[PDB]
Design a protein around this ligand. Structure first.
Ligand SMILES: CNS(=O)(=O)Nc1nccc(Cc2c(C)c3ccc(Oc4ncccn4)cc3oc2=O)c1F
Ligand SMILES: CCCS(=O)(=O)Nc1ccc(F)c(C(=O)c2c[nH]c3ncc(Cl)cc23)c1F
Lengths: 267, 322
């Protein structure tokens, strides 16, 4: 194939980390610790084989310290992608399971690094299409790594896993054939910003996914910004609101988001 | 143990039902606290509906069970509270409610172990039967109407998710409800962790206004139509598709928007009885106050007809799946 295909006898699968509907993530060993995402597909069609090598080609173009390091793929026995192993947990687990006590300067740093990675992807014409705090990993706690981008080619193939909490209204309504854009990614980044600056998920008082889908698509519901931390800088509060705006064209792009954070960081 | 049997005698059972309920409670006493190591996998009985479900054998007892794996990332306090709130299912013993054995948390998944049903869900039954005969949809209606009133009187609970895949059936002709909202923390957890392709949600619940068991009646009516014809009805059938099922897709938001704005679906006239049509029309009233409630449904003409009709449900089921 190309020189990033990995032979299966070289990889030793260890423990099971996560398991969605589109695949399963194992910790493994391949010249040190590694992560293997194995796709739940036993009869991969010539069509799905091509979409996989296409999404692998996109993964092949990313080399950045805030993007999860692609390392190789497997296409014979099964469809899988091998990446670096992050020693910390995902940002979701930090904020919503362990409830780790980040300080304000660390929340801004996570925000800035995430924006740094997203800026890189868009500069390479990559749209994440599914950004949440589940997909942001803290390698050893200090540096964020963005993953679970790509394979939107293969994901589009009753009640599966996934979430609506990070979906832009234009993406929820799905009225265009392609509602995904740099600003739909900005909205998702905005919701991650909300998580960072409140400690909890949006729409915490609504417990009905179908209510959330309807209410957010109509404009009757939006993240409650009154729950932002009191120590949250007032410029950061503006940035949450700017990224979360209902209008797709009113949202900042990541060069501006970066600058907003960088000038804030100059205390 | 016998506190469970005292609550059996507070119900209006017949001779064959008390036999089976008493036999299930004695099997509940064979099993203790459940764990992942205690189970041997047999087959797979489902993939959607909020988690994979396996047919399994509990080694110490020998019992066959259904094990629902619900994957959720939640802080340990919520895990323990979800298992605490699920223990009310030990006290949910009714002919119209599937049984409970125990619940526990392992790996990153809440395991719920419950009564096995060899007939499967009416969702699974429908895709083999094409459409469900009306005589049987009468018997199914009774089971649902009775299970909802059992929950509201003996437990003060709503189902919150009445759909074809949450009605299960037995080779013994039993029709029971499952996957109802016992744990408030589990309700919150599964809204954030899953996505939906279709909806049986009442328009008042979609809009955030006050709701009651009337929302479940709306869901029953929407499920009955979907089982009568062989298709989800939110996008009403084409003038062609109707003439392709009896002879002589929208995204989730567009569905939810349709359920709120456009008139409710109806049973196609001429192929079904008039009372059954009036029955679903009384279930699919948008305004909940003028929608039929549970007592009116039990005295509606369609139910008194169906309750008297002796049907071989168990027979039809084993004929259409095997
Ligand atoms: C779509 N409606 S919603 O209100 O938004 N969400 C929910 N609706 C219902 C329910 C829930 C959550 C929930 C689920 C999914 C469940 C599944 C199996 C189960 O086991 C069992 N065993 C024996 C007998 C009957 N059940 C118990 C269960 O209790 C719950 O609270 C919603 F999250
Ligand atoms: C270069 C990105 C490849 S991806 O976009 O397909 N995503 C992907 C592929 C394979 C994976 F294993 C993962 C993944 O979930 C993790 C990668 N490294 C990790 N470290 C810790 C945890 Cl909990 C999870 C992961 C992952 F996000």
């Amino acid at each position: 194939s190309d020189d990033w295909e990995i032979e299966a006898s070289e990889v030793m699968l260890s423990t099971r980390i996560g398991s969605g509907s589109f695949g399963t993530v194992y910790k493994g060993k391949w010249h040190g610790d590694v992560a293997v995402k194995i796709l739940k597909v036993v009869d991969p069609t010539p069509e799905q084989f091509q979409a996989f090598r296409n999404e692998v080609a996109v993964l092949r173009k990313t080399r950045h310290v805030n993007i999860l390091l692609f390392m190789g793929y497997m296409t014979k026995d099964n469809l899988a992608i091998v990446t670096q192993w992050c020693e910390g947990s995902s940002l979701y687990k930090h904020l919503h399971v362990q409830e780790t006590k980040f300080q304000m300067f660390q929340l801004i740093d996570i925000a800035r690094q995430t924006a740094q990675g997203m800026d890189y992807l868009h500069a390479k014409n990559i749209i994440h299409r599914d950004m949440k705090s589940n997909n942001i990993f803290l390698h050893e706690g200090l540096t964020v790594k963005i993953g679970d981008f790509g394979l939107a080619t293969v994901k589009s193939r009753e009640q599966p896993t996934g979430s609506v909490l990070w979906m832009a209204p234009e993406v929820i309504r799905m009225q265009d054939n392609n509602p995904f854009s740099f600003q739909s990614d900005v909205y998702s980044y905005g919701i991650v910003l909300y998580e960072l600056m409140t400690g909890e998920l949006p729409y915490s008082h609504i417990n009905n996914r179908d209510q959330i889908i309807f209410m957010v698509g109509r404009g009757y519901a939006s993240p409650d910004l009154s729950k932002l931390y009191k120590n949250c800088p007032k410029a950061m509060k503006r940035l949450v609101a700017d990224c979360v705006k209902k209008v797709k064209e009113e949202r900042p792009l990541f060069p501006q988001i970066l600058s907003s954070i960088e000038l804030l960081q100059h205390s | 143990l016998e506190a469970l049997q005292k609550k059996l005698e507070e119900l209006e059972l017949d001779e064959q039902q008390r036999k089976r309920l008493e036999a299930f409670l004695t099997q509940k006493q064979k099993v203790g606290e459940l764990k992942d190591d205690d189970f041997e996998k047999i087959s797979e009985l489902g993939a959607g509906n909020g988690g994979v479900v396996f047919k399994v054998s509990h080694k110490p007892s020998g019992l066959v069970m259904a094990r629902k794996l619900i994957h959720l990332e939640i802080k340990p306090a919520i895990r323990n509270q979800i298992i605490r709130e699920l223990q009310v299912l030990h006290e949910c013993n009714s002919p119209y409610i599937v049984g409970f054995y125990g619940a526990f948390y392992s790996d990153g998944e809440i395991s719920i172990c419950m009564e096995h049903m060899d007939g499967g869900s009416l969702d699974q039954v429908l895709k083999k039967a094409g459409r469900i005969p009306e005589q049987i949809l009468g018997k199914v209606s009774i089971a649902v109407i009775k299970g909802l009133t059992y929950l509201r009187e003996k437990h003060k609970i709503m189902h919150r998710d009445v759909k074809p895949s949450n009605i299960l059936v037995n080779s013994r002709g039993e029709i029971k409800l499952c996957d109802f909202g016992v744990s408030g923390q589990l309700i919150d957890a599964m809204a954030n962790a899953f996505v939906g392709t279709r909806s049986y949600m009442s328009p008042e619940r979609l809009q955030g206004t006050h709701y009651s068991v009337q929302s479940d009646i709306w869901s029953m009516g929407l499920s009955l139509v979907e089982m009568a014809v062989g298709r989800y009805p939110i996008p009403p059938p084409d003038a062609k598709e109707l003439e392709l099922m009896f002879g002589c897709p929208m995204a989730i938001f567009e569905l939810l928007d349709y359920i709120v704005n456009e008139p409710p679906p109806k049973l196609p006239s001429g192929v079904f009885s008039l009372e059954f049509q009036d029955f679903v029309n009384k279930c699919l009233i948008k305004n909940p106050a003028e929608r039929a409630d549970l007592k009116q449904l039990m005295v509606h003409a369609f139910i008194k007809r169906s309750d008297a009709e002796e049907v071989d449900f168990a027979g039809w089921l084993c004929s259409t799946i095997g």
